[PDB]
């Protein structure tokens, strides 16, 4: 797309690695280790796709 195609998404991180041929369809807010963070985004919390 001439100004950018944003219809294709990719994943930057998970909780851990993944076994072969597996599908991680589930999407949720990801926190970093020990900080209590849920519901919305912010510090050490943003949408992984």
């Amino acid at each position: 797309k001439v100004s950018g195609n944003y219809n294709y998404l990719y994943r930057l991180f998970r909780k851990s690695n993944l076994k072969p041929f597996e599908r991680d369809i589930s999407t949720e807010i990801y926190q970093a280790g020990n900080k209590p963070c849920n519901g919305v985004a912010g510090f050490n919390c943003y949408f992984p796709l």
Epitope: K1, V2, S3, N7
Partner: antibody
Framework: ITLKESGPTLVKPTQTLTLTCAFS??????????VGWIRQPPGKALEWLAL???????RYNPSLKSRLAIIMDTSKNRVVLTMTNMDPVDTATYYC???????????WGQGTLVAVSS | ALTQPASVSGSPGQSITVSCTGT?????????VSWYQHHPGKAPKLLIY???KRPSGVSNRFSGSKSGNTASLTISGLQAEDEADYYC???????????FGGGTKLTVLG
Amino acid sequence: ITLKESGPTLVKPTQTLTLTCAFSGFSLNTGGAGVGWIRQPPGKALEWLALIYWDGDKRYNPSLKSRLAIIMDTSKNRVVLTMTNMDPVDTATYYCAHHKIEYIFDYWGQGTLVAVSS
Amino acid sequence: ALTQPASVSGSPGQSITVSCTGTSSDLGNFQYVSWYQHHPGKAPKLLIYEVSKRPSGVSNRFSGSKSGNTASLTISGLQAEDEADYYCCSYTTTTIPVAFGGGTKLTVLG
């Protein structure tokens, strides 16, 4: 393939332009093709206005977002461009065309010219 | 950006060549640049897509080639109705994503 362009002849300085263009015959089962609108006045070269894909995405020229709207029929009949708050420098001719990405404008319509009544 | 000479002239029959160029920083790797022709009172038509690929319906006398930062087209065997408004259109990533020539008006001396 036929492309039909319709628009007013003379418009008021405070009126909004409603250009229409109809296309007959395309391979709609594709990706990246679409319908584009371009204009030029006499005495100055060409400049692009807008382009629409088949997924409903609208791409206008920058800093002209608010005064450009597109009616897409979802029936493969016609595409309408409605532009508000016109300027007497925009009194120009308008071409509706098909838009791939290699062919920047593959087939060109006849287009219609418009001028201000002021 | 993208620029070309405003007008060009020469002897009828042969000996004409029209070129475009632009700044390499604005130009996104210089792919998919096309050459069109505009007539007064008639709809413009496509002649050359992506430098040196020939579409259907055109004659073999039209040719195009690009060297370094400059692209160009040549035509041999000119006629009395071969005056044109040859435009180059290209992709520019930093500014407005499409750029459309600088204006040409070929004239003959017949």
